[PDB]
């Protein structure tokens, strides 16, 4: 078979077979991330923000210099202050980006940005989160669809890099969302391969045992068969115990052609989780000018 | 019968027996306020913040000169900024305090301070709102008790006058909360009568058709019979439309032995709403003098 990995992401080599899943314990500075939930009451339903978080850490690595230069030109942007209190400092985020349980970026997400969502049985989508943090698109909880590419006031909680990535200009939107509900294996496989080779970071949503019946994770790499159809994917899941890390999921189909994923073979008693959607983040590396 | 009115409040003189209630249409600069919900989805469940708002407007009047000097000496406290965006301007609040529907203080509460609450079936208590706005005490949605008089960081949403009214100092807490549990018609009358006499603004909580079966309103005046027993009260209610204004409520023990209030006399066929508690705000102009 053949495989494709997220740009700048080193395939783990510490993969071991456990009781429930084949995984690779987290290793820092390997290109990938694994933000972990503590279910402190604030991040209980924020896997979407956890997924956006992991994609943002990747994004930091990719634009390491592009960012340092950006801040120098706009020192104002480095921090987010609320009537005297410092809510966030991007450099603190970058310095803690490798921390699973206490990265400053996720801390900002659960504590200051989206504190009440978990209490309202509401989650968030990776793209909205990223669009807010970067472009400053005002994140609205009633927006069931993509970010409406328009001009408008910046969201106080984000817009750190909106001096470069503006609102209302399609060439500055660095994210995308795709529906997989009624797609077959070929369709899903092609889209995912394409995105992974265009150097984008990927987020995958699938059915789950939660109120929303939707859970999102990071998809770092994928294996394709001789015909180019998915056989497995490598993911990071914010719901997992920090000690698990990178997870290997099988990718299969049932007699109705629905695509599902699982930590075990899609063997008729275990049906896995049906895939529902895909989100992406491009570095936009050549737009900082 | 003797009546007792809130300090600085002039009794309405335009009461008219309406369809369902005896009320006095709102007139500005009479000392009392009537912030009114628009039910725009954000203020639908913020009766607690509107009551706090009306109390804070009263507080603006009582401490006008002191606030003027305070803002002069602490320029930075006038505005609340969030990463480049202006969330609030106390002077705009003061300038628009007389408005029932679009006062700037209530706009700030429904739009920026407590927007999410009306989508969480959650309400706020008037004392917590005031403690956050004045002292800067962090408002906790889970705290079902009084504001803990302990030190701590300032809530970014308030602390406007915390250079004077600090956190952690019991002499700087200007609010109080009282429960009418296991209390009788006389203990209640005395408390209210007393709070009103001590020059404080009052908030009254009672049973209501909402998730918590608890709705709060402002208690501006109170009539007492020749024996000193509460007979009626004059309140403003953020759930009433803007044309109502000051409402008169009868007070009395219904057939279940509970003290209640109603827009009509308490009878066998009218048990009214059961009172649950009181909230108060003192001017604190003694701390201004320091």
Taking each helix axis as running N to C, give the angle between helix A47-62 and helix A64-73, from 0 to 180 degrees, rounded to the nearest 10.
Answer: 90
Minimal Cα–Cα distance from A187 to chain B, Å?
38
Within 8 A by CB and 6+ apart from A38, the residues are A101
- Of the candidates A82, A119, A120, the beta carbon closest to that of B83 is on A82
Distance between terminal CA atoms of chain B? 40
Q: Between residues 103 and 122 of chain A, which touch chain B (CB distance below 8 Å)?
A: 116, 119-120
Cα–Cα distances in Å, from B173 out to B7, B51, B198, B243?
19, 18, 16, 35
Q: Verify whether the Cβ–Cβ distance B85 to A116 is below 8 Å.
A: no
Within 8 A by CB and 6+ apart from B60, the residues are B67, B93, B94, B97
Q: What is the DSSP letter of A96?
A: H
Q: Among A280, A285, A287, A286, which residue's Cα sits nearest to residue A131?
A: A280
> B290 in contact with A at a CB cutoff of 8 Å?
no
Q: Please state the domain extents for chain B.
A: 1-27+174-282, 28-173
Cα–Cα distances in Å, from A282 out to A6, A7, A257, B83, B223?
11, 10, 30, 26, 70
Residues of B in contact with A82 (CB under 8 A): 81-83, 156
Calpha distance B39→B239 (Å, rounded): 9
Calpha distance A117→A129 (Å, rounded): 13
- Of the candidates A83, A157, A159, the beta carbon closest to that of B156 is on A83
Calpha distance B273→B264 (Å, rounded): 11
> Choosing among B41, B76, B83, B138, which should be mutated to test the A contact, i.e. which has the most A CBs within 10 A?
B83
> A142 in contact with B at a CB cutoff of 8 Å?
no
Distance between terminal CA atoms of chain A? 40
CB A75 within 8 A of CB A143: no
Residue A203 DSSP SS3: strand
SS (H, E, C) B98-114: CCCCCCHHHHHHHHHHC
Minimal Cα–Cα distance from B196 to chain A, Å?
35
- Determine how many CB atoms are found less than 10 A away from the CB of residue A125: 26
- The string of DSSP letters for A231-243 reads EEEEEE-TTS-TT
CB A280 within 8 A of CB A201: yes
> A75 in contact with B at a CB cutoff of 8 Å?
no
CB A271 within 8 A of CB A191: no
For the domain covering B1-27+174-282, report its CATH number: 3.90.70.10
Residues of B in contact with A138 (CB under 8 A): none
Residues of B in contact with A157 (CB under 8 A): 83
Q: Verify whether the Cβ–Cβ distance A85 to B154 is below 8 Å.
A: yes
Residues of B in contact with A161 (CB under 8 A): none
> Choosing among A42, A74, A83, which should be mutated to test the B contact, i.e. which has the most B CBs within 10 A?
A83
Q: What count of Cα atoms within 13 Å lies in the side-chain half-sphere of residue B172?
A: 22
Structure-solving method? X-ray
Residue A86 DSSP SS3: strand
Going by their DSSP bridges, the two strands A201-206 and B85-89 should be labelled as unpaired
Q: What is the DSSP letter of A61?
A: H
Q: Among B160, B169, B146, B152, which residue's Cα sits nearest to residue B290?
A: B169
- Determine how many CB atoms are found less than 10 A away from the CB of residue A137: 29
Taking each helix axis as running N to C, give the angle between helix B47-62 and helix B64-73, from 0 to 180 degrees, rounded to the nearest 10.
Answer: 90
């Amino acid at each position: 078979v053949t495989s494709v990995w997220t740009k700048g992401v080193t395939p783990p080599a510490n993969f071991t077979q456990g009781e429930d899943v084949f995984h690779a314990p987290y290793v820092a500075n390997q290109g990938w991330y694994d933000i972990t939930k503590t279910f402190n009451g604030k991040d209980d339903l924020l896997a979407g923000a956890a997924t956006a978080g992991n994609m943002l850490h990747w994004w930091f690595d990719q634009n390491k210099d592009q960012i340092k230069r950006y801040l120098e030109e706009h020192p104002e942007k480095q921090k987010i202050n609320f009537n005297g209190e410092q809510m966030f400092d991007v450099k603190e985020a970058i310095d803690t980006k490798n921390h699973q349980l206490d990265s400053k970026l996720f801390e900002y997400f659960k504590e200051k940005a989206f504190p009440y969502l978990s209490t309202k049985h509401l989650g968030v989508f990776p793209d909205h989160v990223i669009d807010m943090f970067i472009n400053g698109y005002r994140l609205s909880l009633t927006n069931h669809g993509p970010t409406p590419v328009k001009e408008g006031s910046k969201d106080p909680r984000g817009g750190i890099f909106d001096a470069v990535f503006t609102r209302g200009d399609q060439s500055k939107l660095l994210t995308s969302r795709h529906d997989f509900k009624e797609k077959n294996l070929k369709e899903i496989s092609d889209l995912i391969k394409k995105e992974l080779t265009e150097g984008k970071a990927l987020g995958l949503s699938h059915t789950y045992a939660n109120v929303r019946i939707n859970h999102v994770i990071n998809l770092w790499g994928a294996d394709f068969d001789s015909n180019g159809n998915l056989k497995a994917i490598y993911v990071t899941d914010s719901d997992s115990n920090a000690s698990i890390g990178m997870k290997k999921y099988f990718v299969g189909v049932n007699s109705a052609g629905k695509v599902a994923i699982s930590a075990k073979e899609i063997k008729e008693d275990n049906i896995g989780a049906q895939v529902l959607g895909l989100f992406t983040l491009s570095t936009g590396q050549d737009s900082w000018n």
